[PDB]
Paper text:
Zhx1 to 3 (zinc-fingers and homeoboxes) form a set of paralogous genes encoding multi-domain proteins. ZHXs are multidomain proteins comprising two C2H2 zinc finger motifs and five homeodomains. In transient co-transfection assays [name] isoforms have all been shown to function as transcriptional repressors.
The structure determination of crystals grown using protein derived from OPPF_2273 ([name] [name]-3) revealed a number of unexpected features. Firstly, it became clear during the refinement that the two [name] homeodomains present within the asymmetric unit were of identical amino acid sequence and were not covalently linked, unexpected for protein derived from the bidomain [name]-HD3 construct. The second unexpected feature for [name] [name] homeodomain was the unusual conformation and dimer formation. The change involved the rotation of helix I by ~180° compared to the usual homeodomain conformation, giving a more opened out structure with some disruption of the hydrophobic core. A [name] [name] homodimer is observed in the crystal which is further stabilized by a disulfide bridge formed by linkage of Cys494s. The switching of the positions of the two helices I in [name] [name] provides an example of 'domain swapping'. Thus, this homeodomain conformation appears to be unique amongst reported crystal/NMR structures for this domain class. However, the dimer we observe in the crystal structure serves to bury some of the exposed hydrophobic residues at the interface between the subunits.
Numbering used by the authors:
A (entry chain A), B (entry chain B): 446 to 501
C-alpha cells in the first residue's frame, strides 16, 4: 500500500476522534460532563489509540 | 465517571472506525483499494486501537 492510500485510511479512521463542537455539545447534554472534561478524555484516548497502532 | 457517561464517549470516539458503505465507496474512489482490502485494514486498526486503550 502506498503512503497516499494509507493517508486516506487514517484520515477516515480518525474522523470521530476529533469531534466538532456540535458533537461536543451533543455529548454534554447526554453525559453532563464539562467541555474540558470531554476534551481531556478524547485527547487521552487518541494518545492511547495511536500508541496501540504504532507499537503493533 | 459513570459507565453511562463512558458509553457515550466510546460510542462517539468509535464512530468512524465502522465506515458505512457510502464512506467505503468514498475510500475506494480516493484510494483504489478493494472493498475487502479496506475492511481488513480498518478491522486490523480497530484491534490495535482497542489494545492501546486497554493496555495503556
Amino acid at each position: 500500500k502506498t503512503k497516499e492510500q494509507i493517508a486516506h485510511l487514517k484520515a477516515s479512521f480518525l474522523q470521530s476522534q476529533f469531534p466538532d463542537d456540535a458533537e461536543v455539545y451533543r455529548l454534554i447534554e447526554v453525559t453532563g460532563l464539562a467541555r474540558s472534561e470531554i476534551k481531556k478524555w478524547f485527547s487521552d484516548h487518541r494518545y492511547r489509540c495511536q500508541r496501540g497502532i504504532v507499537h503493533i
